[PDB]
Amino acid sequence: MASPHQEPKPGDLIEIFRLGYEHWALYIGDGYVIHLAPPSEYPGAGSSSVFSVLSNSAEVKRERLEDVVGGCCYRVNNSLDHEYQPRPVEVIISSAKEMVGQKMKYSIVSRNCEHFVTQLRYGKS
């Protein structure tokens, strides 16, 4: 491609290959994102007291695009908007700035991710 990198659109959501797993993020400003920290750790914790156990709690966090993308791969993938919705972009960015600091525990990682980006949208879904 001619472009230097992929460009995320404001109030649209990005699939992030952050780790040995796929995360979601929402572009709230020019270079700023809201993203999910899953209810599980990376496998093989490396401590003499614990290695195989990885159970934890989920948190929604605010961060820079260049940090979320640093050492990582990514793609814009706004599933439900591509499937149907018109979406009130300013109210999605406002909803992401309300979801900052939210926590979750009852769902498994795959649904914990989808339920997060459904709560980021939640408008025309």
PDB file of all heavy atoms in Angstrom, residues 10-36:
ATOM      1  N   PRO A  10     -12.207   7.772  14.088  1.00  0.00           N
ATOM      2  CA  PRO A  10     -12.659   8.202  15.411  1.00  0.00           C
ATOM      3  C   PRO A  10     -14.044   7.625  15.711  1.00  0.00           C
ATOM      4  O   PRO A  10     -14.960   7.706  14.894  1.00  0.00           O
ATOM      5  CB  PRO A  10     -12.598   9.735  15.410  1.00  0.00           C
ATOM      6  CG  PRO A  10     -12.745  10.087  13.930  1.00  0.00           C
ATOM      7  CD  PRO A  10     -12.028   8.933  13.225  1.00  0.00           C
ATOM      8  N   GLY A  11     -14.157   6.993  16.883  1.00  0.00           N
ATOM      9  CA  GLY A  11     -15.359   6.310  17.370  1.00  0.00           C
ATOM     10  C   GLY A  11     -15.584   4.917  16.788  1.00  0.00           C
ATOM     11  O   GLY A  11     -16.565   4.275  17.158  1.00  0.00           O
ATOM     12  N   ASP A  12     -14.738   4.442  15.873  1.00  0.00           N
ATOM     13  CA  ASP A  12     -14.715   3.053  15.391  1.00  0.00           C
ATOM     14  C   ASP A  12     -13.735   2.198  16.211  1.00  0.00           C
ATOM     15  O   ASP A  12     -12.881   2.712  16.941  1.00  0.00           O
ATOM     16  CB  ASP A  12     -14.402   3.001  13.882  1.00  0.00           C
ATOM     17  CG  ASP A  12     -15.677   3.196  13.052  1.00  0.00           C
ATOM     18  OD1 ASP A  12     -16.381   2.185  12.820  1.00  0.00           O
ATOM     19  OD2 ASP A  12     -16.012   4.351  12.699  1.00  0.00           O
ATOM     20  N   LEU A  13     -13.901   0.873  16.111  1.00  0.00           N
ATOM     21  CA  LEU A  13     -13.201  -0.105  16.941  1.00  0.00           C
ATOM     22  C   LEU A  13     -12.265  -1.027  16.153  1.00  0.00           C
ATOM     23  O   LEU A  13     -12.489  -1.377  14.993  1.00  0.00           O
ATOM     24  CB  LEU A  13     -14.192  -0.827  17.871  1.00  0.00           C
ATOM     25  CG  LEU A  13     -15.349  -1.594  17.203  1.00  0.00           C
ATOM     26  CD1 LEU A  13     -14.992  -3.072  17.000  1.00  0.00           C
ATOM     27  CD2 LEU A  13     -16.600  -1.458  18.080  1.00  0.00           C
ATOM     28  N   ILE A  14     -11.173  -1.377  16.825  1.00  0.00           N
ATOM     29  CA  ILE A  14      -9.940  -1.937  16.280  1.00  0.00           C
ATOM     30  C   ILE A  14      -9.676  -3.274  16.981  1.00  0.00           C
ATOM     31  O   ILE A  14      -9.680  -3.338  18.211  1.00  0.00           O
ATOM     32  CB  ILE A  14      -8.738  -0.979  16.534  1.00  0.00           C
ATOM     33  CG1 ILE A  14      -9.059   0.539  16.482  1.00  0.00           C
ATOM     34  CG2 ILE A  14      -7.629  -1.315  15.520  1.00  0.00           C
ATOM     35  CD1 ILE A  14      -7.909   1.413  17.002  1.00  0.00           C
ATOM     36  N   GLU A  15      -9.431  -4.323  16.207  1.00  0.00           N
ATOM     37  CA  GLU A  15      -8.956  -5.614  16.686  1.00  0.00           C
ATOM     38  C   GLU A  15      -7.431  -5.519  16.857  1.00  0.00           C
ATOM     39  O   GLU A  15      -6.730  -5.150  15.912  1.00  0.00           O
ATOM     40  CB  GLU A  15      -9.353  -6.671  15.645  1.00  0.00           C
ATOM     41  CG  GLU A  15      -9.170  -8.109  16.131  1.00  0.00           C
ATOM     42  CD  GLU A  15      -9.500  -9.112  15.010  1.00  0.00           C
ATOM     43  OE1 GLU A  15     -10.567  -8.984  14.360  1.00  0.00           O
ATOM     44  OE2 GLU A  15      -8.685 -10.036  14.770  1.00  0.00           O
ATOM     45  N   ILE A  16      -6.912  -5.818  18.052  1.00  0.00           N
ATOM     46  CA  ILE A  16      -5.492  -5.672  18.416  1.00  0.00           C
ATOM     47  C   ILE A  16      -4.893  -7.037  18.785  1.00  0.00           C
ATOM     48  O   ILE A  16      -5.289  -7.658  19.773  1.00  0.00           O
ATOM     49  CB  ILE A  16      -5.309  -4.690  19.606  1.00  0.00           C
ATOM     50  CG1 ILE A  16      -6.063  -3.342  19.501  1.00  0.00           C
ATOM     51  CG2 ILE A  16      -3.807  -4.440  19.848  1.00  0.00           C
ATOM     52  CD1 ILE A  16      -5.660  -2.446  18.327  1.00  0.00           C
ATOM     53  N   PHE A  17      -3.874  -7.471  18.048  1.00  0.00           N
ATOM     54  CA  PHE A  17      -3.047  -8.631  18.381  1.00  0.00           C
ATOM     55  C   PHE A  17      -1.983  -8.196  19.407  1.00  0.00           C
ATOM     56  O   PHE A  17      -0.811  -8.001  19.078  1.00  0.00           O
ATOM     57  CB  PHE A  17      -2.468  -9.207  17.077  1.00  0.00           C
ATOM     58  CG  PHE A  17      -1.644 -10.466  17.254  1.00  0.00           C
ATOM     59  CD1 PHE A  17      -2.264 -11.659  17.676  1.00  0.00           C
ATOM     60  CD2 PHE A  17      -0.258 -10.457  16.993  1.00  0.00           C
ATOM     61  CE1 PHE A  17      -1.506 -12.831  17.841  1.00  0.00           C
ATOM     62  CE2 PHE A  17       0.500 -11.631  17.158  1.00  0.00           C
ATOM     63  CZ  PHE A  17      -0.124 -12.819  17.578  1.00  0.00           C
ATOM     64  N   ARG A  18      -2.429  -7.965  20.652  1.00  0.00           N
ATOM     65  CA  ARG A  18      -1.629  -7.357  21.733  1.00  0.00           C
ATOM     66  C   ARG A  18      -0.600  -8.319  22.346  1.00  0.00           C
ATOM     67  O   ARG A  18       0.409  -7.886  22.903  1.00  0.00           O
ATOM     68  CB  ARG A  18      -2.582  -6.781  22.804  1.00  0.00           C
ATOM     69  CG  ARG A  18      -2.194  -5.395  23.350  1.00  0.00           C
ATOM     70  CD  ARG A  18      -0.909  -5.365  24.192  1.00  0.00           C
ATOM     71  NE  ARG A  18      -0.808  -4.109  24.962  1.00  0.00           N
ATOM     72  CZ  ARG A  18      -0.189  -2.983  24.615  1.00  0.00           C
ATOM     73  NH1 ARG A  18       0.443  -2.849  23.469  1.00  0.00           N
ATOM     74  NH2 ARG A  18      -0.207  -1.955  25.435  1.00  0.00           N
ATOM     75  N   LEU A  19      -0.874  -9.620  22.264  1.00  0.00           N
ATOM     76  CA  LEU A  19      -0.316 -10.688  23.100  1.00  0.00           C
ATOM     77  C   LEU A  19      -0.531 -12.041  22.386  1.00  0.00           C
ATOM     78  O   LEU A  19      -0.799 -12.068  21.181  1.00  0.00           O
ATOM     79  CB  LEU A  19      -1.031 -10.575  24.479  1.00  0.00           C
ATOM     80  CG  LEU A  19      -0.309  -9.739  25.556  1.00  0.00           C
ATOM     81  CD1 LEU A  19      -1.203  -9.638  26.802  1.00  0.00           C
ATOM     82  CD2 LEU A  19       1.046 -10.343  25.961  1.00  0.00           C
ATOM     83  N   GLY A  20      -0.481 -13.167  23.111  1.00  0.00           N
ATOM     84  CA  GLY A  20      -0.878 -14.500  22.620  1.00  0.00           C
ATOM     85  C   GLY A  20      -2.406 -14.668  22.529  1.00  0.00           C
ATOM     86  O   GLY A  20      -2.925 -15.752  22.791  1.00  0.00           O
ATOM     87  N   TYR A  21      -3.111 -13.584  22.195  1.00  0.00           N
ATOM     88  CA  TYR A  21      -4.565 -13.398  22.225  1.00  0.00           C
ATOM     89  C   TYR A  21      -4.972 -12.086  21.510  1.00  0.00           C
ATOM     90  O   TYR A  21      -4.154 -11.168  21.370  1.00  0.00           O
ATOM     91  CB  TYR A  21      -5.044 -13.406  23.689  1.00  0.00           C
ATOM     92  CG  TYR A  21      -6.551 -13.347  23.852  1.00  0.00           C
ATOM     93  CD1 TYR A  21      -7.351 -14.363  23.296  1.00  0.00           C
ATOM     94  CD2 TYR A  21      -7.153 -12.262  24.520  1.00  0.00           C
ATOM     95  CE1 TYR A  21      -8.754 -14.282  23.373  1.00  0.00           C
ATOM     96  CE2 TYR A  21      -8.555 -12.182  24.618  1.00  0.00           C
ATOM     97  CZ  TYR A  21      -9.357 -13.184  24.025  1.00  0.00           C
ATOM     98  OH  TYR A  21     -10.713 -13.095  24.067  1.00  0.00           O
ATOM     99  N   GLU A  22      -6.234 -11.986  21.075  1.00  0.00           N
ATOM    100  CA  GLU A  22      -6.782 -10.830  20.358  1.00  0.00           C
ATOM    101  C   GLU A  22      -7.668  -9.982  21.286  1.00  0.00           C
ATOM    102  O   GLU A  22      -8.639 -10.469  21.868  1.00  0.00           O
ATOM    103  CB  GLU A  22      -7.587 -11.268  19.122  1.00  0.00           C
ATOM    104  CG  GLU A  22      -6.760 -11.996  18.051  1.00  0.00           C
ATOM    105  CD  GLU A  22      -6.469 -13.462  18.417  1.00  0.00           C
ATOM    106  OE1 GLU A  22      -7.422 -14.276  18.486  1.00  0.00           O
ATOM    107  OE2 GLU A  22      -5.284 -13.818  18.620  1.00  0.00           O
ATOM    108  N   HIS A  23      -7.337  -8.698  21.402  1.00  0.00           N
ATOM    109  CA  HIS A  23      -8.053  -7.703  22.200  1.00  0.00           C
ATOM    110  C   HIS A  23      -8.869  -6.751  21.293  1.00  0.00           C
ATOM    111  O   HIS A  23      -8.648  -6.685  20.081  1.00  0.00           O
ATOM    112  CB  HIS A  23      -7.029  -6.884  23.018  1.00  0.00           C
ATOM    113  CG  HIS A  23      -6.228  -7.644  24.052  1.00  0.00           C
ATOM    114  ND1 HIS A  23      -6.090  -7.290  25.377  1.00  0.00           N
ATOM    115  CD2 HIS A  23      -5.375  -8.696  23.833  1.00  0.00           C
ATOM    116  CE1 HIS A  23      -5.177  -8.107  25.931  1.00  0.00           C
ATOM    117  NE2 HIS A  23      -4.719  -8.993  25.032  1.00  0.00           N
ATOM    118  N   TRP A  24      -9.762  -5.955  21.895  1.00  0.00           N
ATOM    119  CA  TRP A  24     -10.457  -4.852  21.218  1.00  0.00           C
ATOM    120  C   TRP A  24     -10.026  -3.486  21.770  1.00  0.00           C
ATOM    121  O   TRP A  24      -9.704  -3.353  22.956  1.00  0.00           O
ATOM    122  CB  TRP A  24     -11.971  -5.011  21.390  1.00  0.00           C
ATOM    123  CG  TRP A  24     -12.616  -6.111  20.610  1.00  0.00           C
ATOM    124  CD1 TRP A  24     -13.237  -7.177  21.148  1.00  0.00           C
ATOM    125  CD2 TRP A  24     -12.806  -6.227  19.169  1.00  0.00           C
ATOM    126  NE1 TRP A  24     -13.764  -7.971  20.146  1.00  0.00           N
ATOM    127  CE2 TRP A  24     -13.535  -7.425  18.901  1.00  0.00           C
ATOM    128  CE3 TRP A  24     -12.470  -5.419  18.062  1.00  0.00           C
ATOM    129  CZ2 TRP A  24     -13.888  -7.814  17.601  1.00  0.00           C
ATOM    130  CZ3 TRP A  24     -12.820  -5.798  16.754  1.00  0.00           C
ATOM    131  CH2 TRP A  24     -13.523  -6.993  16.520  1.00  0.00           C
ATOM    132  N   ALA A  25     -10.098  -2.450  20.930  1.00  0.00           N
ATOM    133  CA  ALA A  25      -9.935  -1.051  21.328  1.00  0.00           C
ATOM    134  C   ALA A  25     -10.842  -0.094  20.531  1.00  0.00           C
ATOM    135  O   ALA A  25     -11.249  -0.413  19.420  1.00  0.00           O
ATOM    136  CB  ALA A  25      -8.451  -0.676  21.186  1.00  0.00           C
ATOM    137  N   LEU A  26     -11.139   1.081  21.090  1.00  0.00           N
ATOM    138  CA  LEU A  26     -12.012   2.126  20.534  1.00  0.00           C
ATOM    139  C   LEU A  26     -11.218   3.434  20.442  1.00  0.00           C
ATOM    140  O   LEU A  26     -10.744   3.928  21.462  1.00  0.00           O
ATOM    141  CB  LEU A  26     -13.216   2.263  21.497  1.00  0.00           C
ATOM    142  CG  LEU A  26     -14.483   3.009  21.019  1.00  0.00           C
ATOM    143  CD1 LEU A  26     -14.238   4.434  20.514  1.00  0.00           C
ATOM    144  CD2 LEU A  26     -15.234   2.207  19.950  1.00  0.00           C
ATOM    145  N   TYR A  27     -11.079   4.003  19.245  1.00  0.00           N
ATOM    146  CA  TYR A  27     -10.321   5.239  19.000  1.00  0.00           C
ATOM    147  C   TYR A  27     -11.106   6.492  19.442  1.00  0.00           C
ATOM    148  O   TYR A  27     -11.908   7.041  18.686  1.00  0.00           O
ATOM    149  CB  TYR A  27      -9.927   5.245  17.512  1.00  0.00           C
ATOM    150  CG  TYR A  27      -8.835   6.214  17.095  1.00  0.00           C
ATOM    151  CD1 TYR A  27      -7.559   6.159  17.686  1.00  0.00           C
ATOM    152  CD2 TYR A  27      -9.055   7.098  16.024  1.00  0.00           C
ATOM    153  CE1 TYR A  27      -6.516   6.974  17.208  1.00  0.00           C
ATOM    154  CE2 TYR A  27      -8.024   7.917  15.537  1.00  0.00           C
ATOM    155  CZ  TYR A  27      -6.740   7.844  16.117  1.00  0.00           C
ATOM    156  OH  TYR A  27      -5.717   8.587  15.613  1.00  0.00           O
ATOM    157  N   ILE A  28     -10.906   6.940  20.687  1.00  0.00           N
ATOM    158  CA  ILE A  28     -11.654   8.071  21.284  1.00  0.00           C
ATOM    159  C   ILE A  28     -11.140   9.463  20.895  1.00  0.00           C
ATOM    160  O   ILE A  28     -11.891  10.433  20.997  1.00  0.00           O
ATOM    161  CB  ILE A  28     -11.719   7.974  22.826  1.00  0.00           C
ATOM    162  CG1 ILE A  28     -10.332   7.820  23.493  1.00  0.00           C
ATOM    163  CG2 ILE A  28     -12.672   6.841  23.225  1.00  0.00           C
ATOM    164  CD1 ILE A  28     -10.332   8.219  24.974  1.00  0.00           C
ATOM    165  N   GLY A  29      -9.881   9.578  20.467  1.00  0.00           N
ATOM    166  CA  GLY A  29      -9.262  10.840  20.061  1.00  0.00           C
ATOM    167  C   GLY A  29      -8.157  10.600  19.050  1.00  0.00           C
ATOM    168  O   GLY A  29      -7.795   9.453  18.794  1.00  0.00           O
ATOM    169  N   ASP A  30      -7.603  11.676  18.496  1.00  0.00           N
ATOM    170  CA  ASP A  30      -6.497  11.596  17.547  1.00  0.00           C
ATOM    171  C   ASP A  30      -5.220  11.107  18.267  1.00  0.00           C
ATOM    172  O   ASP A  30      -4.448  11.893  18.825  1.00  0.00           O
ATOM    173  CB  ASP A  30      -6.279  12.956  16.864  1.00  0.00           C
ATOM    174  CG  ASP A  30      -7.437  13.336  15.934  1.00  0.00           C
ATOM    175  OD1 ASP A  30      -7.531  12.758  14.825  1.00  0.00           O
ATOM    176  OD2 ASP A  30      -8.241  14.224  16.309  1.00  0.00           O
ATOM    177  N   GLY A  31      -5.030   9.784  18.276  1.00  0.00           N
ATOM    178  CA  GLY A  31      -3.928   9.073  18.930  1.00  0.00           C
ATOM    179  C   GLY A  31      -4.264   8.431  20.278  1.00  0.00           C
ATOM    180  O   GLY A  31      -3.353   7.920  20.924  1.00  0.00           O
ATOM    181  N   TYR A  32      -5.532   8.405  20.702  1.00  0.00           N
ATOM    182  CA  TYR A  32      -5.956   7.885  22.015  1.00  0.00           C
ATOM    183  C   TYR A  32      -7.052   6.816  21.910  1.00  0.00           C
ATOM    184  O   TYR A  32      -7.971   6.934  21.100  1.00  0.00           O
ATOM    185  CB  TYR A  32      -6.413   9.052  22.900  1.00  0.00           C
ATOM    186  CG  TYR A  32      -5.272   9.959  23.324  1.00  0.00           C
ATOM    187  CD1 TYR A  32      -4.990  11.134  22.603  1.00  0.00           C
ATOM    188  CD2 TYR A  32      -4.468   9.601  24.423  1.00  0.00           C
ATOM    189  CE1 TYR A  32      -3.914  11.959  22.981  1.00  0.00           C
ATOM    190  CE2 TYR A  32      -3.390  10.423  24.811  1.00  0.00           C
ATOM    191  CZ  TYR A  32      -3.111  11.607  24.089  1.00  0.00           C
ATOM    192  OH  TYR A  32      -2.072  12.407  24.452  1.00  0.00           O
ATOM    193  N   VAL A  33      -6.964   5.775  22.745  1.00  0.00           N
ATOM    194  CA  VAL A  33      -7.833   4.586  22.683  1.00  0.00           C
ATOM    195  C   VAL A  33      -8.315   4.118  24.059  1.00  0.00           C
ATOM    196  O   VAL A  33      -7.628   4.265  25.066  1.00  0.00           O
ATOM    197  CB  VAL A  33      -7.153   3.382  21.977  1.00  0.00           C
ATOM    198  CG1 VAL A  33      -6.982   3.595  20.471  1.00  0.00           C
ATOM    199  CG2 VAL A  33      -5.777   3.019  22.557  1.00  0.00           C
ATOM    200  N   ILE A  34      -9.508   3.524  24.078  1.00  0.00           N
ATOM    201  CA  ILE A  34     -10.080   2.784  25.219  1.00  0.00           C
ATOM    202  C   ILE A  34      -9.980   1.303  24.853  1.00  0.00           C
ATOM    203  O   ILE A  34     -10.342   0.941  23.741  1.00  0.00           O
ATOM    204  CB  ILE A  34     -11.549   3.205  25.454  1.00  0.00           C
ATOM    205  CG1 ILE A  34     -11.673   4.694  25.832  1.00  0.00           C
ATOM    206  CG2 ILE A  34     -12.249   2.319  26.503  1.00  0.00           C
ATOM    207  CD1 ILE A  34     -11.089   5.090  27.192  1.00  0.00           C
ATOM    208  N   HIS A  35      -9.484   0.437  25.727  1.00  0.00           N
ATOM    209  CA  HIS A  35      -9.213  -0.969  25.405  1.00  0.00           C
ATOM    210  C   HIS A  35      -9.440  -1.892  26.613  1.00  0.00           C
ATOM    211  O   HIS A  35      -9.490  -1.429  27.752  1.00  0.00           O
ATOM    212  CB  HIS A  35      -7.780  -1.091  24.853  1.00  0.00           C
ATOM    213  CG  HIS A  35      -6.702  -0.875  25.889  1.00  0.00           C
ATOM    214  ND1 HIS A  35      -5.999  -1.856  26.554  1.00  0.00           N
ATOM    215  CD2 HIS A  35      -6.266   0.330  26.374  1.00  0.00           C
ATOM    216  CE1 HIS A  35      -5.163  -1.256  27.419  1.00  0.00           C
ATOM    217  NE2 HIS A  35      -5.291   0.082  27.349  1.00  0.00           N
ATOM    218  N   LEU A  36      -9.572  -3.202  26.367  1.00  0.00           N
ATOM    219  CA  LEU A  36      -9.858  -4.192  27.410  1.00  0.00           C
ATOM    220  C   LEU A  36      -8.607  -4.955  27.858  1.00  0.00           C
ATOM    221  O   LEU A  36      -7.838  -5.462  27.038  1.00  0.00           O
ATOM    222  CB  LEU A  36     -10.922  -5.163  26.861  1.00  0.00           C
ATOM    223  CG  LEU A  36     -11.432  -6.225  27.858  1.00  0.00           C
ATOM    224  CD1 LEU A  36     -12.272  -5.603  28.981  1.00  0.00           C
ATOM    225  CD2 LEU A  36     -12.267  -7.256  27.096  1.00  0.00           C
TER     226      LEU A  36
END
